[PDB]
């Protein structure tokens, strides 16, 4: 209904249309379409927001691009990279993790879009995002 709870920072990346692929190969089809994406989009520290199924990015770089909200009703796989990868840090000097989720908006042509994002905090990594967007979501853990 509203939306205020958490709030994190990342880095994004750039969403790129898998066109209904699955969950766990769109993460790879996108990576790999993301890592070596020539051009390569600039990276820059967006703030994670989970509110009531409702993930916001909001530019706190410099002003890049405006703000977005992606309902976890999208939000189909949010897992770190298969590929055991990490973005191409976020602009000389600066490796951090690479991690994508699937967003499955709209039931049209299960067209999805991977969007890829690296951890930009010293104290929440890619895995640390990806154990909390699954926590908030279905899911138990089992093991950790």
Same mark, same amino acid.
């Given at each position: 209904?509203s939306?205020?709870?958490a709030a994190?920072n990342?880095?994004f990346?750039?969403?790129?249309?898998?066109?209904?692929?699955?969950?766990p190969?769109?993460?790879?089809?996108?990576?790999a379409?993301?890592?070596?994406? %020539?051009?390569?989009?600039? @990276?820059?520290?967006?703030? $994670?927001k989970?509110?009531? !199924? /409702?993930? +916001?990015?909001?530019?706190?770089?410099?002003?890049?691009?405006?703000?977005?909200?992606?309902?976890?009703?999208?939000?189909?796989?949010?897992?770190l990279?298969?590929?055991?990868?990490?973005?191409?840090?976020? %602009?000389?000097s600066g490796? @951090?993790?690479?991690?994508? $989720?699937?967003?499955?908006? !709209? /039931?049209? +042509?299960?067209?999805?879009?991977?969007?890829?994002?690296?951890?930009?905090?010293?104290?929440?990594?890619a895995?640390?995002?990806?154990?909390?967007v699954?926590r908030v979501m279905l899911?138990?853990?089992?093991?950790?």
């Amino acid at each position: 209904g509203s939306h205020m709870g958490a709030a994190c920072n990342v880095l994004f990346i750039n969403s790129v249309e898998m066109e209904s692929l699955t969950g766990p190969q769109a993460i790879s089809k996108a990576v790999a379409e993301t890592l070596v994406a %020539d051009p390569t989009p600039t @990276a820059t520290i967006v703030h $994670f927001k989970v509110s009531a !199924q /409702g993930i +916001t990015l909001t530019d706190n770089q410099r002003k890049l691009f405006f703000r977005r909200h992606y309902p976890l009703n999208t939000v189909t796989f949010c897992d770190l990279d298969p590929q055991e990868r990490k973005w191409t840090k976020t %602009d000389g000097s600066g490796p @951090a993790k690479l991690f994508g $989720f699937v967003a499955r908006k !709209q /039931g049209s +042509t299960t067209d999805n879009v991977c969007h890829l994002f690296a951890e930009l905090d010293p104290d929440q990594p890619a895995a640390a995002i990806v154990n909390f967007v699954s926590r908030v979501m279905l899911g138990s853990g089992q093991k950790r």
